[PDB]
Amino acid sequence: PKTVYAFPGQGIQHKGMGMEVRARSKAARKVWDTADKFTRDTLGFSVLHVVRDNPTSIIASGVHYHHPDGVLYLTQFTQVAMATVAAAQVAEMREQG
Amino acid sequence: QRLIGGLSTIGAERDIASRLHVVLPGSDGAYGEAKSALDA
Amino acid sequence: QRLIGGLSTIGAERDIASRLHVVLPGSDGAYGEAKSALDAVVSRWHAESSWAARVSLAHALIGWTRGTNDAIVAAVEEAGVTTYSTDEMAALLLDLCDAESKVAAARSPIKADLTGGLAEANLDMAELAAKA
């Protein structure tokens, strides 16, 4: 059938998004590995750690970012977490046919 | 070396590219004992 | 060193001028670990004088023996280091126990090399281990 894939916005984030998908699949594990490899080689943090735990304040390449409820909840980290979760989920559900 | 392992471990996943730095002291026979302590 | 202390102790007062004789094995990083194992016994030898009347040190840096693999032997003979069998190594080790070597080792610790070319660190152990 003719389907629509629609992708959400803010407010969806929490600690531990798609970790069960990372535990189930292998292509999703591969795309998590390429994602956090790319961001620790370019940006200067571990997006796997930013999703898997919610630390108080991390240091980027130059500066440190702080958000007292959790560093998962501010702008850049919410968006890259949503990006890697959507990419991992669609890679898993396209390798499952 | 247990100490350097632990102190290197505690700031690992939070702050990458943040490297601990160690200064070893070496204090003739006492210097030989010190170098034997070094080259492990 | 507890062993050499005990074996030097047991024939002390009965047979003076009867000196025990030790042969140490040293087996790049493994040779560094071996030399670090060496320069505690040798340092205690030069330090404590109760050892000096009873013990006679000698050390051999051992080479590469082909028993405890065939690809390892082929790789190191392509590298050029001369290997040994266990009997060859035992003869070229036990030759350090004749009268000349023990009279010479009575003064100072003999530090002999028997390694047939792995003393230069051209190739490393993990470098061969990934290949093997």
Side-chain angles (χ1 to χ4, degrees), chain B residues 29 32-33 36 39, chain C residues 32-33 36 39 43:
Chain B
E33 292 176 352
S36 67
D39 201 2
Chain C
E33 292 176 352
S36 67
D39 201 2
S43 69

Side-chain angles (χ1 to χ4, degrees), chain A residues 27-58:
Chain A
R29 180 66 179 270
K30 183 177 179 180
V31 72
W32 281 105
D33 290 330
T34 59
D36 64 354
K37 181 178 179 180
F38 176 75
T39 189
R40 74 176 65 249
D41 289 332
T42 299
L43 297 181
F45 63 96
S46 177
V47 69
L48 178 60
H49 177 66
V50 174
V51 176
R52 183 176 181 269
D53 197 0
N54 193 0
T56 303
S57 181
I58 63 171

Side-chain angles (χ1 to χ4, degrees), chain A residues 40 44 49 55-57 59, chain B residues 12-18:
Chain A
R40 74 176 65 249
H49 177 66
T56 303
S57 181
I59 299 176
Chain B
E13 68 272 15
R14 184 182 296 275
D15 303 333
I16 65 168
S18 68

Side-chain angles (χ1 to χ4, degrees), chain C residues 3-15:
Chain C
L3 189 70
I4 298 167
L7 273 312
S8 61
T9 306
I10 61 168
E13 68 272 15
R14 184 182 296 275
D15 303 333

